[PDB]
Structures are given as C-alpha cells and as structure tokens.
Design a protein around this ligand. Structure first.
Ligand SMILES: NC(=O)c1ccc[n+]([C@@H]2O[C@H](COP(=O)([O-])OP(=O)(O)OC[C@H]3O[C@@H](n4cnc5c(N)ncnc54)[C@H](O)[C@@H]3O)[C@@H](O)[C@H]2O)c1
Ligand SMILES: NC(=O)c1ccc[n+]([C@@H]2O[C@H](COP(=O)([O-])OP(=O)(O)OC[C@H]3O[C@@H](n4cnc5c(N)ncnc54)[C@H](O)[C@@H]3O)[C@@H](O)[C@H]2O)c1
Ligand SMILES: NC(=O)c1ccc[n+]([C@@H]2O[C@H](COP(=O)([O-])OP(=O)(O)OC[C@H]3O[C@@H](n4cnc5c(N)ncnc54)[C@H](O)[C@@H]3O)[C@@H](O)[C@H]2O)c1
Ligand SMILES: NC(=O)c1ccc[n+]([C@@H]2O[C@H](COP(=O)([O-])OP(=O)(O)OC[C@H]3O[C@@H](n4cnc5c(N)ncnc54)[C@H](O)[C@@H]3O)[C@@H](O)[C@H]2O)c1
Ligand SMILES: Nc1ncnc2c1ncn2[C@@H]1O[C@H](CO)[C@@H](O)[C@H]1O
Ligand SMILES: [Cl-]
Ligand SMILES: [Co+2]
Ligand SMILES: [Co+2]
Ligand SMILES: [Co+2]
Ligand SMILES: [Co+2]
Ligand SMILES: [K+]
Ligand SMILES: [K+]
Ligand SMILES: [K+]
Ligand SMILES: [K+]
Lengths: 461, 461, 461, 461
C-alpha cells in the first residue's frame, strides 16, 4: 500500500537488500551505533530531510537513523550517483525516497521538492542531513517557515561546509550545523582513502584503459587530491600535480610527485599563449579535485593530448568547462556516463576521428558516476559521524529555544574528538586491529586520560 | 684568533665547510631568508642560546642567524647527534660551539653550561633556540635571573613543546615561546618525511641488514611513526603498527598496515603473561616513535626474536627500557652506536652467542645517532621557521615590556599560516615545482586572497 | 542475410563497435601489423578456428586476422568471459561467432562445435588459435581427420602450453604449435601486469569491498601470482603468499611479502589437523593463481574467516574445490558471478546468516568473469604475437609437406626474439617512450647489432 | 708469524670479526653448506685464486671455502670496494689477502699478482673465483702454464660472463667455467634487490641528499637497472628510464616509469645538437647500469643540470666518460669517493661555484665504493652458488682429463636448477617463510616431482 516514493525499478529491491546485508557487515561503527542506541531511541520524533548520494552505503545510514527512531524523506545530491538497487530496497522498506541514476536537472530539483513536501504541503521536518548544500539552500531561499521548526543541519562534504560558513558570515544561516566533513574519521578517511579506492575504479569501469605507464595530471592536492593522486600512482601512472596552495604543493613534492601548472609560470592571463601546450600535449588523464571553478578550462581542453580522459571528482561539475565543450564540440556517447568529445566541430564527426577527448560522468563526480563511490568500510566512518551529529543536534532542540538562547548556539561546529576517536576505534576493530591501552604512568607522562582524548584539538594527524 | 669553543677535531673544519656550501644549495628557504633580510639586519643585538643537534643543517641555521645580525653560543641537544666536521666548521668561523659526537652525560651538561656562561659569568643572552627543552629547563631551574633579559624561546620538536605547555599551565613559564614544531612545513615535513629518509638510512649504516622480507614493529603512528613506517615499508619490510590513539591506528590500517599490540588485548598488566610472545617472537626490528615512556619495556625485550634490532627515534631514550638491559645483560660494542645485548647474562657472553639483541645509538634517537639525521632540503623548512620565529620574538622585545603587557604576551603560539605558506613556496621552488596562481574569480569563489592564506586555521592537510 | 552466429543480443553491436574503435587506438602493435601487412595479405586462404575469451580485445585481434586475409569461426574459451557487445559487433561484421556471457557447460561445448562444423559438416579449417587447449583437444580426440588439413596451432596461455607439451612428449600432437605464452611481450606483460590491472578491478566490481587494511592470501607466485599480489598490495592489502617453488617464494620474500602455507609445516596430509586454522581464520581474501588442482581445498574453505572472498584467476576453476561447496553448502546469488556460500549447511540459508563465503565467477577466471580482463594496451602485446605466430605457421604449410619434412617441423616453438623486441618497441612507442639507438661502438662493445636482438636466448628479463 | 698479506690496518681484525659473526647469522644458505659439507671436505686439495670485493660478505664466503677444505689467496676486484675491517679479519685468520679501500690502479694490479705468486713463483693454484674477469684475463695472457693445472673458473657477475663467452667463442678459453651470475638466486636476487638496497644507501652516505621529489635518470633497465630504479622510486624520486632493449623498455613503462633517451629521438648524431638538453637540464641524478661503454658521455655531462649527482653501478667505470672530466674540468674532493667536478675550467675553481657535478666513487660501482654493497642476506644467495660451483668444477678435475675428454667439457655453464632451488629454499627459510609441499596428485597434475625442479629450463621467473 506504500506509494510515497519514486525509483527507477522497484523490482531491484531484493538485489539491493542482499547488498545492504553485506554492507552492514562492512560497517561496524554504524552498526555499533544501531546496537548501542536502539533501546533508548535517541531519534524518536526526529523527521529528517536527507539529500545525499542514494548508494548502498546511504541505505545503511538511512536504516540506522530509522532504527534509532527517525522518520526520513530522502533524495540524492547528484543526478548520477544513485544506485537503483539501493533506492529500490529503501523504498521497499516503506521509506520515502526519490532518486534514480541518470536524472535530468529538472528531475533532480523535483526529487528534492518531493522530500520537502508531503501530500502537497510542507512536511513536519525538524532535521536536515545534507551533502553539498543544495537542499540547505533551497530551504533557506524558499521554505523559511520550515526552518523555524528544524533543529539542525549535518553537512557531509567540504563544499557544503563552505556554503554553510558563508551563510554564517552573512548572518543568513537559520539553524545550527555540524561540520561532519572535518571529523578526522571523515576528512582523513573518506575524502582521501575513499577516492584512492574509487577513482581508478571509476576510470576502469568507464574506459577499461590501462593506467600503468601513462601520464596523469591531478588538479589539486587537498584530501581528495591526495587520495586521487595515490589512486593513479599505485596503478603505475606518471602523476603530475597542480596546486595553488604551496603547503599542499610541498606535500606533493615530498610524496614523490612533480608539481606543475597548466599555465606558463602558473600565470593564467586568459590567452591561449599562457598555456603550457607542451605539458598538456603529453597528459593522458586529467582529474580535478579542487572544489573550485574552471580549473580545467577551455584552453587547457584545447591543448590536451588527443584521446585524453577528462574527469572530475570534486563535488560540482563546473571544475571542468563542460559548457565550452557542449557549445563547440560534438558529443558521442560511448555508453552511459562515457562520452567522446570530438574537437573537430559542433555538428557531426567522422566516426573514426582521432581528435577527441573522453569525458566521464559528464564532468560530475566520477567515482559515484562511473562506479559506486567509496566502499562501505570507509563510508562507515563518515556515516557513523552523521548519526552522532544527528543525535547531538536533535537533542539540543534548537528550534524550541528562545531567541536569546538560539543566538548562543547558532554555529557551524564539529563533533568532539572523543566521539571521533570512538568511531575510529570501531573501524580499527573492524580490521581486527588491537589498540594498546596506556598504563596510568604512561597516561600521566603524556598528560592524557587512559580513555582519551589522546591529542589536543590543534593536532593535524 | 678564536679559542672559545670545544669540538672533537678542529682540523675537520675544511671538510665541514665544503659540506656547508653544498647544504646551502639544498636549503633555498633558509638561504632565501638570508638574502631577503641581509641588509635589514633584523637580528642585530640578538644573543641567542642555541641547543640543537650540531649537524651540517644546524650549521646553515647558525650562519643564517649570524648573517642577520645575531651572536650565538651553541651546543647539541643529544650526545650522539653532533657531526664533528660541522661543529669544527662552525668553531672555525669564530662561533662558540661546544659539541662533539659521543659525549658522556657529564660532558653533555658541561656543554650546555659553556653556552650559558661566558668567561666565568652568565652571558647577556636575550634569545633561546631549543630542541627538546633541556636548555629551557636549565634556565628556569638554575638561571632564572637570565630569563629576565630573554625575549623568547623558539622550540623545535614535539617533546619540547609539551614541556613548554606544562610550564605555561603551571604558571612557571618565564618567557613566551613559539611552537616551531607545529608549522606544517615542520611537523608534516620534518617529523614525517625526515624520518622516512633517515630511519632506514641509520639502520643500514649501523647493521647493513637487508630489510626487505623481514618483520618490523613500529610503536606509534604519529608524524614520526607515519614516516618511520613508510621508511621500512618502502624497503619491503612487513610492518605492523602499535598505537594507543584509535584515530592514528585507523590511518595505519588504511595505509596498509596491520595494527597490533605487544600486550594481549592491548592490556599491559605488568606481568610477562600479558606479553604476546608469539607476536614478538617474529619481530626482526622494533622502532619506538612515541615520545612516551617505556613503550618497549623489559618484558617485551625478553620476548623479542633472537638477534632483533632495537632502536628509538623519539627524542628521549627512555622509550626503551635500556636501564633494564644495562642491569641484566652483557653489552658488546660492535662499533660506535651499535651494541649487541646478550640475554644470557651480565658478566660474560660467548663470542658466538646467538641469543642477543642489536641496540642502535644506545636507545638515543637513531637517525642522528647512527646516520646524519634529516637531509638538508627537509631541515630547510624547519629552520626557515626557526629563523622567522627568532625574528618575531626578538622584535617583540618581551623583556623590555611593562608587567601589564608582559602577562598579555606570555604564550606558546605558532607562526601565522601566511609565513608557513611562504616557507612552503620556497621549498616547492627548490624542487622546480610551479604553483598555480588563482585568478580573481577563483579566489573569490573559494573566499581567499590570491596571495593566501589559502586554508582556514582548522585545516589539517 | 548473415545468420551464422549465436550471440546474446545483436542490438549491442553499435556499442561494441564504439569500444572497438577506442581499443584500436589502445593497441598500436596490433594495428601496426594490420597496416604493415594489409597489402601483402599474408593470411589469404587461412581459415582459423579461434577459441578465446570473446572480449573487445579479441575483437581487434579477429578483425586484424580478417584484414590480413583470413576467414575465422570463433568461440569463447570460458563461459563467463564474453563481452556481449564485442560478440555482437563481430557478428554484425559477418563473422561466425558463437559466444555470450553466462553460458552453461553444455552451451560451451555446443559453441565450439559450431565453429568446427559449418552447415553440419566439418569446416575446411587450416589454422587453430586457442586459449587453454579445449578446442585443441576436441580436434585431436574427436575430429582427427580435420587436423590433416591444419597447418598449426597458436596457443595463448600457460595451461594450454602444458597440454601441448604433454601431447608432444606422448607423440599425440598432430600439428605444430607456437607457444605464444612465452614471448616476453606476453608472459611478462599479459600474465603479470594484466592481472595487476584486472584482479582488484574484478573484486571491486563484484563486491565493492574496501581492500586496504585487509588480509589477503595469494596461492602461487608465478607470472599471474606476481601480478595478482601487486594488484592487492598496491591497494593497501596485507598480502601473504603461498608457493611450492622455493625460487618463486624467494622472489615473494624480496618483494616484501610474508610467505606462508595453508598447511602446518607446508605438509598437507589430507586431514583438518594439518590446516593452519589460525592463519586462514584471519584471511579476508584468497586468490588462486597456480594452474594446479585443488590449491584451495575443502578443509581450507572450512577454516577461512567468516565472509572471506574466494576467487580464482588461474585458467580453470578446479583450483578451488567448488564441487565440495556445491555439495555441502547453500548458495545465495547476490548478482551474476557473485555468490554467498553459507557454511551453515545444505538445507536452507538464513538471509542474515553471518557464516558465509563470497565466491566470484563460480571459481572461473575472476578478472574476465567479474570485470573485462586485461586492458587493450596490455592485450596488444599478446595479440600482436598471436598474429605473427599465425602468419609464421600458415606460411610453413605443414599439412602440404612430405611426411619426412613434417616430422622435422612437428614442434612446440616460441617466436624469435627479434619479433618479440619489435612487438615491445611498438608498445613502448604507444606510451611515448623513446628508446636509445646504440652507436656502432657500443653495439660492438656488447656484441649485438644496433637493430637487435639485444639479449641471448637464455636471458630472463 | 703470518705475514703473507697486505691490508690497510690489521688492528681492525676484531671489528671485522664481530661483523663476520653477525653476517653468518644473515647468510643461512652459506652456513647451511658449511654445516652440510664440513665432514665431507669437498674442497680438500682445492687452491683457489679469488678476486672479488673484499667485503664482510666475501669474508663469510672465504671462510666457508676454507671450512670445506680449500686454501685461498685473495684480492679485491675493485679499488674502492674493500671493507678494511673485513680484509684485516681475514688476514688475522692466517689467510693470504691483498686488498684495501682506496687502491691505486698500480696497487690493484700488484694485489692480483700477489695472489698469483707465492714466494716469488707461481702458486700451485687449481681453481679460480672471479668477479669481472680481470684475474681470468691475467691468467690467460700472462700465466698460461698455471691454467694447465686449474680445474675451472666460477664467475660472479654479468660483465665477467660476457668476457668468458667471448673467450669461448674465440677458442681462447683454457679452462671451463660456471656462470654463477645466471642462477636465479643470483641475477634475480643479487643484481636486482641488492642494488635496490644499496644504491640509495650509497647516495645518502656520500651526499646526504634528499631524494624524494627530485628527478632521476637511470640508464639501463636490466637486472641492475630494475633494482636501481626501484631504489630511487621507493624513496620518492621521479625516475625516468633509458634503454636500448625495447623489451626492457616495455617493462619500465609497465612498472610506472617514463622511458626517455638522452639524445633527441634516441639518435646520437655525433654533436651536442642531438643532446636533449631540456631533458638533461632537469635531471638531479643520473645512474648508469648498463655494463656498456660511454652511456653517460661528455656531451650529456655538459648538458646536465647544475649540481646534479653522477654515479655508476655497473662493473666498470667507463660507463661514464670520467676521462673527459679529468682532462677538462677541475676536481674538488668533498670527502673520500665524493668529488665536485667544476665545469668552469680545468685550471681551478671558486669555492662557491654553482656550476659543478657531484661524482661518486670516481665512476666506480657506487654501492660498494660509497657504502658496503649488497647486504649479507642477499649475498647469501650469490655466494652459496659460488661454493656449489667451486665444488662442482673442482670435483670434475678438468686439468687431469686427457685432451679428448677436456674437449667434451670445455664450456661456460650454469648450475642445475635443482641447486638453484635448494639455495632459494634456505633463503626462504631465513625469512621464516614456509614453502608448501605438493601432494602426489598435484605433482602429477603439473608434471613435476614433489622434490622439484618445479620449472622448465626455459622459465624466466
Ligand atoms: N567524490 C568524492 O567522493 C568526494 C569526497 C570528498 C570530497 N569531495 C569534494 O571534492 C572537493 C575537494 O574536497 P577536499 O576535501 O579535498 O578539499 P580541500 O580544500 O582539502 O582540497 C582542495 C584543494 O584544491 C586546491 N585548489 C584550489 N583551486 C585550485 C586550482 N585552481 N588549481 C589547483 N589546485 C587548486 C586547494 O589549494 C586545496 O588544497 C570538494 O568539492 C569536496 O566536496 C568529493
Ligand atoms: N628523531 C627525529 O628526527 C625526530 C623528528 C621529529 C620528532 N621527533 C620526536 O619523536 C617523538 C614523536 O613525535 P611526533 O611528532 O611523532 O609526535 P606525535 O604525538 O604526533 O606521535 C606520537 C604517537 O605515539 C603514540 N603513542 C603514545 N604512547 C604510545 C604507546 N604506549 N604505544 C603506542 N603508541 C603510543 C601516540 O598515540 C601518538 O600518536 C617526539 O619525542 C619528538 O620530539 C624526532
Ligand atoms: N586470468 C588471466 O588473465 C590469466 C593470464 C595468464 C595466465 N593465466 C592462467 O593462470 C595460471 C598461472 O599462469 P602463470 O603464467 O602464472 O604460470 P606459472 O607457472 O608462471 O605460475 C604458477 C605458479 O603456481 C605455483 N604453484 C603450483 N602449485 C601450487 C600450490 N599447490 N601452492 C602454491 N603455489 C603453487 C607454481 O610454483 C608456479 O610458480 C595458468 O592456468 C594460466 O593459464 C590466467
Ligand atoms: N654493483 C653491483 O652490485 C652489481 C651487481 C650486479 C651486476 N653489476 C654490473 O652491472 C652491469 C649490468 O648488469 P645486469 O645484470 O643488470 O646486466 P643486464 O644485461 O641484465 O642489463 C644491462 C642493460 O643495459 C642496457 N643498455 C645497454 N646499453 C645501453 C645504453 N647505451 N643505453 C641504455 N641502456 C643500455 C641493455 O639493454 C641491458 O638491458 C654489469 O656490468 C654487471 O657486472 C653490478
Ligand atoms: N657486499 C658485496 N660483497 C661482495 N660482492 C658484492 C657485494 N655487493 C655486490 N657484490 C657483487 O659485485 C658484483 C659487481 O661487481 C655483482 O655481481 C655482485 O654479486
Ligand atoms: Cl660509433
Ligand atoms: Co553532495
Ligand atoms: Co633535541
Ligand atoms: Co582459455
Ligand atoms: Co668484480
Ligand atoms: K560503494
Ligand atoms: K643530514
Ligand atoms: K578489457
Ligand atoms: K654489505
């Protein structure tokens, strides 16, 4: 009798359920929270709007929140990141989900509205779980009355956290948020090792190209850039790295990479003459990891080696100037989320043309677009933090506080290190690792409790 | 024309000068500071007490301070870390230096005193550069009147910073200090990549042991532990990692290491029954990296595989219970800083005994004891921060300020991120790396200045 | 009106053609032969029975053989290795092909018969291209008269060559063969680096398991074992290696792997008491690479850690005792070529049972069964050797020769080193690599020609 | 007492003996032969002329030969490769040895003659152990009557085997020889992994340069070139590889290296204009590994980046045109075996000249000249083959055979694979590895004995 959903094929639910059962055995921290908190039901009464990639891993996150007492309405934060068997299994469980792989931009917006509205009217939501900030901005711009009764936002990714901090700076953030990205068991696990696992994964599934012996250029060397560069280098690629941050560039040099710039002397003056055409003429694969705009621009695309692969693993697809390629070049679909971009003109192409580029996921997040994103055992850390962040903000009950009390708690904060450590401990135990217990003398020698926390907040790991 | 020094062999000065000239070509950030601030002469009047490993790298640091206007009196912070040709070259340049490789503990204390006192009476020092805090504590415990004329302390390493913070929280810190260690171009360069370069280097010079295919156990996975594990793994060792911090252990698992404890279930009950004898019976090499006490204890040493190598790369030698071995086991010197510890007895050993351990540098920090420590191009980052930290505190002139302003500036702080980035930039240029310059639109997009700083202070890299 | 084929779905032909166009640009050695030999038509009159994995890469091989003048009738040598879009593209080109992914065993035997028979009568073939030797043995055991007109066999893989050598020493081999496997551009490219690329690829596609931090056991350390071990180790797995060959075990040790046996002291007495249960109880992934029988036996499977992944990348599925699992344990299909094997027994599994193993491709070649096998740029080397071998034996015309001179040519040979090098050179050029030309003085100095061959036949590379 | 020796410092004997006792525990194959054969005395009556690097490892080899019953007279095959404490320890055991680190070329020849002659007349030698072929050449050209009574030669290295085969081809080889180099436990252990261990080791001891993030060019990708490339890559260097063998170049590409040539298009046109100056102007370190002549020629040396390090790890120094640098450029000794080559003129140099190269070991093999060569556990394999080869040829008694029998046995051969495997087995056991024993069914399946040999002679490993 349940119809409050829209997925690609509900008959895929049994397959999704089999994969959810597997993923549970791969996510000990998330399943540890399920057992620890099921009796006390900390999310009883919570009504969570969720917008994050509708994968098998998100499925385990959704059912954990529900198991702790929440009701949810869910959509994906990307048009290509949904796993249809995951969405089908969630909808089969009676959970409102509006997501499928290959949405159009209009369908993407429609799916978010379907979570916001129930039976044509605003849902009685009181919590928000977001990845990238799209759902968060729509609520602020269009549904401010709903935010009055929402207790908090838990944001997954670097880009979303940037947008939250902009709203806080401008005095336009309406409810407090927890920066889930900057838990060490998120940023230094998800962003880095997740992309290490899934970047070459997506490139292989999309192209089946040998990577060993070829030239790669990674734009950026943050957490995603670090993991992305290792994903290619461990496959045998000759990887060069571009960065605007000299500290990250220093790490790239020390990690054994040649730090280069697409522009002569690193100065992009807007002309084709500032492009290091000799450098780009050798690159077989360029990956953007910056969260910035136009870091693989039109003039870089013009100068790339013939038949090079172009992909983005940053959150939004404007890191590559795909708009330029649509306006000027002919797109030939090899298969879903794999396109040959013929640089010979806009209208038509010789099917045996050799002057083309291969674009993955149409410039969207390549790991989730052409593969399945991060593996369950890595997302275990990010999503255990998500559950702890939902519990924390829901227990605070910001929406119920008076005006003078709301003002003292309107912030974008991170979880305490003690909880960060406790998530990490379950992850380590999941590998069969054994952490040593400090003796009382040792604990006093380095000035910490035997239980932790073991590092000051300034520690960078 | 100069006789206020004490080195092992002044005839080594020409050799040391030849290596100093090479090291300058390997330290562009430090030498870059030398030229930029040369005419300004910002350290004129500075009289710096310096206590840090008297290596060739420290030699370039000393002559950078002198070139900027400073007068110094120097000693080493470790008995085995001095390079005798470096100390000879410094002494030959008319700089008071009291350091040589192979000091006794008595001679170690005498060397720090020869810097503190000039011609029988206390020097009119006004600045302090320290590595580990031994000189800092002597000043506070034995020469507190000299601290009245001292403007600040610049501390190199993790252990010294811990001691600085303890004095601050007890109200005993007499002068402000700069945590040079927690610059990213220090901790995430020196502590990590330095030990990656110099750990296997020191193990090779001491034993010439093949490392590939053997079993290692690294105690600790902080910055030193991360670099030490990679030093051994990149040589092909099978590395297991012990940690008390679950977050660091999580990093170790994701980095591809098995996380183990020397104690069953990680619980040391002080008894041999708690030792995982099967695990330690397979370890060919153990390395301590914790900055903690007794992390390789007497019971672990008894259970270690025969002929296993024992060494420490933390700052102080008490990470290993060498006192137990001195009390109970016979020591056979193979060569300087290499001993066979025969577990068959104290008062004699069969020349062909098979039941022994190999101890490097008598438990003192092994990279400087059995090799030359970190390479010049890495210490470039650390010591560019040291010079900047000295310039900062000396310009503050804390000692000449009223009491109301003294208590306001009495702190242990780090250099601004902007200087951290400018140090990193010179290091990248030294590799031939080219950093990209943000366009104005990109800088506005991510909310930074084109000049930087490029990261929020919370960023962990 | 061409209907002489059987594929899964001919409407996939255009997709396959798009991927064949890309594959051609990834296979410069194969496409170089196609253009070097097109006008000469060296395979005019050749009628080739081909039996090898019907992949995109095989498609480029087939169309190369056709472009040089040959007629072919093709099947796949494995029930799971066909790429249906590749089979469709070939069938759409008017080429008899009988292959689809997911054949039953009876359909597999039927497909080879459809190549052997045209219109119910034995085809007038004169060449054989084989991978594994199944087609070769059927011709010898069932169609011997057909071998009177066959000029030669070109065998792709290690297992197939073993079978050819057994027939040669028994005097049952009726036509000469070329050992394509033992070209250096095959065995030391395909067998090693191919599995390096495609082993972790298949495991990710089948399970999406995180590999970093988990425990793997690779049975065997030949060419396939070496590449498989590197596939897992580069992902951060802790890899242990098993071997019966001490020389190969020595290489594993030096490469940084712990060498272990599933049996106590390496002695398999057939009892569970000989299984090293403590070792296998920690293994998350076992991979067989031996070409031998029952190297992952029933008692090993009983002792494996719960939820461990089991797969074989050797040629035949009897490396793992899947017959035991099919007889005693309950199989739950997750998706095609992914089965959970519940060790709770044979009569009903619980969907939430935790005591299962995950078997990939039902024990068949996992890289081809769960992914797409080796990438085009690697198969370029193997299939360029295939073309040269087919040319060589077809030119010899063994079947049209005197009996005395036929006996002089009945042999299992490898291609000459000069052609091996010429294949490698085109692969090197495909990477943009530039080899150096020896000067005549240098060529004399080492006793070679400037043109090569550069190594004696004893050289092992 | 005993005076039949010449070494640097006899008082180093005790230190050398302590390191010999350690090395015995690192060489289980060599010590296993000592244990297995001591009672049989297989070398009773053997009188071995030995010319090979007088290291600690050669010391264990010498004492194993003596322990099996032989007498020896020894010299080093390189002027810089002797460890003076090893030579002193051997002389102190009453064994004739003529070697010291830092010989002149004239002293090198004198040392070899001191082994050949005892008390001014030819020694009653009957066996030869050689590394490089210098001793072999002198006997053929100057002492042919001694070769009448010599039963054979055991040659260690690739360059020496080449010289043997030249003499055999020309009919000038007077006694049979065993190619020790081409045992797999030699060439694929010593040549590869030995240089992996000792190349970066020697570069660090000589220069203490940071290697990570810098540019290397390895000339050659044979066994030594493969090991040398890994030695630099595992340290974080950006390694480019040069080769003339396209098969070896193919392996470099697949191993993740860019394959380049010092000459434009790989062609030397006899002028500086054919030098890729852009490439060489970026190289921080060049290593020659070829066994060829002038692979780092004068014009390459002129175009190398300022302050680049230049070293050779081939057997002979003529891989680098050191003669050109001697004639044209000023040499400044940094320290023993480390020279700055000032490219500003032959006359003199400014101490602060930036235009110099750093040459290690004056172009002689750098691992032995600037460090200690391969570690004991690797040399265990090579030198166990040496002992077995000495036994095999001494037992054959070629010198006592009639002319007609000599003709049937005058050859350059390798040890049988069975012995190669038994050497490997002891090396594997030294790591704690456990080799699996084949079942009788498994042995029959792959067609080998359960005892081995396990591979055909064609197998390349
Ligand atoms: N696909 C995934 O699974 C996944 C996971 C986590 C984060 N992300 C996304 O990836 C992006 C990066 O995330 P992060 O956590 O690594 O952030 P980060 O801030 O740590 O790294 C981004 C880096 O890009 C560099 N950069 C910026 N502009 C540049 C330019 N023009 N050229 C070169 N370098 C430039 C910055 O210096 C910075 O170090 C974000 O959009 C984030 O949401 C994706
Ligand atoms: N020799 C060198 O060149 C060099 C360079 C830098 C720092 N250091 C020294 O090395 C030490 C470590 O420095 P760091 O920067 O890595 O500090 P860190 O705090 O970043 O790392 C130390 C780690 O040890 C772990 N640890 C503590 N007690 C433990 C125990 N009983 N068992 C297992 N793990 C345990 C902690 O959890 C922590 O992660 C300090 O003494 C520092 O001064 C030496
Ligand atoms: N799937 C692919 O893409 C692919 C590619 C090439 C070859 N293959 C197949 O893989 C198999 C191996 O090929 P290869 O070239 O590596 O052959 P190989 O002879 O070089 O290696 C096989 C190794 O297995 C070892 N071995 C045998 N029995 C063992 C046992 N009981 N325990 C442990 N080790 C044992 C042998 O010592 C040998 O070193 C063959 O069947 C071959 O046809 C598959
Ligand atoms: N120092 C040591 O410890 C050590 C150990 C073993 C061997 N060696 C010596 O090292 C040398 C190489 O030994 P190997 O066993 O590796 O021999 P190898 O034949 O296996 O490798 C040498 C390689 O050099 C390549 N080459 C030749 N001329 C070249 C040129 N002009 N440019 C580029 N590449 C070129 C060849 O193609 C060949 O692959 C020999 O002289 C040997 O005696 C030294
Ligand atoms: N430590 C060492 N002791 C003795 N011989 C060595 C050592 N290192 C390398 N060699 C040998 O030197 C030869 C090259 O001259 C190689 O064949 C190798 O076996
Ligand atoms: Cl010439
Ligand atoms: Co998102
Ligand atoms: Co110190
Ligand atoms: Co086959
Ligand atoms: Co030699
Ligand atoms: K996934
Ligand atoms: K140093
Ligand atoms: K493929
Ligand atoms: K050595």
């Amino acid at each position: 009798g349940f119809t409050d959903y829209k997925v690609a094929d509900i008959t895929l639910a049994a397959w999704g359920r089999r994969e959810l059962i597997i993923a549970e055995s791969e996510m000990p921290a998330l399943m540890g929270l399920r057992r620890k908190y099921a009796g006390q039901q900390p999310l009883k009464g919570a009504k969570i709007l969720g917008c994050i990639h509708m994968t098998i891993q998100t499925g385990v996150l959704i059912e954990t929140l529900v198991a702790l007492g929440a009701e949810v309405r869910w959509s994906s934060c990307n048009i290509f990141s949904t796993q249809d068997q995951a969405a089908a299994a969630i909808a089969a469980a009676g959970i409102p989900v509006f997501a499928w792989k290959g949405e159009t931009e209009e369908e993407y917006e429609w799916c978010i509205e379907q979570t916001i509205l129930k039976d044509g009217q605003p849902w009685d939501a009181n919590m928000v779980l977001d990845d990238g900030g799209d759902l968060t901005e729509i609520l602020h711009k269009k549904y401010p009355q709903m935010l009055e009764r929402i207790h908090g936002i838990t944001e997954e990714t670097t880009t979303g956290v940037h947008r939250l901090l902009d709203m806080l700076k401008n005095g336009t953030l309406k409810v407090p948020a927890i920066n889930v990205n900057d838990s060490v068991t998120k940023s230094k696990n998800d962003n880095k090792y997740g992309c290490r696992h899934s970047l070459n994964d997506a490139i292989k599934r999309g192209t089946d190209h040998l990577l060993s012996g070829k030239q790669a250029l990674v734009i950026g060397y943050g957490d995603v850039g670090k993991g992305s560069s290792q994903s290619l280098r461990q496959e045998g690629m000759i990887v060069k790295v571009a960065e605007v941050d000299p500290i990250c560039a220093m790490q790239a040099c020390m990690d054994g990479f040649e730090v280069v710039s697409p522009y002569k002397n690193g100065i992009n003056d807007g002309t084709e003459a500032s492009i290091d055409a000799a450098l780009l003429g050798k690159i077989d694969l360029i990956v953007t990891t910056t969260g910035n705009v136009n870091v693989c621009d039109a003039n870089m695309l013009k100068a790339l080696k013939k038949r090079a692969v172009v992909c983005n693993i940053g959150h939004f697809d404007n890191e590559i100037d795909t708009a330029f390629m649509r306006k000027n070049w002919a797109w030939e679909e090899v298969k879903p989320q794999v396109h040959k971009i013929h640089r010979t003109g806009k209208d038509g192409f010789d099917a045996h043309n050799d002057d083309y580029l291969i674009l993955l996921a149409e410039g969207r997040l390549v790991n989730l677009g052409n593969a399945t994103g991060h593996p369950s055992r890595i997302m275990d850390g990010s999503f255990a933090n998500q559950v702890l962040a939902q519990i924390h903000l829901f227990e605070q009950k910001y929406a119920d506080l008076p005006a003078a009390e709301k003002a003292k708690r309107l912030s974008v904060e991170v979880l305490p290190k003690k909880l960060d450590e406790e998530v990490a401990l379950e992850m380590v135990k999941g590998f069969g690792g054994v952490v040593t217990q400090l003796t009382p003398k040792q604990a006093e020698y380095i000035g910490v409790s035997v239980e932790g926390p073991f590092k000051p907040d300034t520690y960078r790991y």
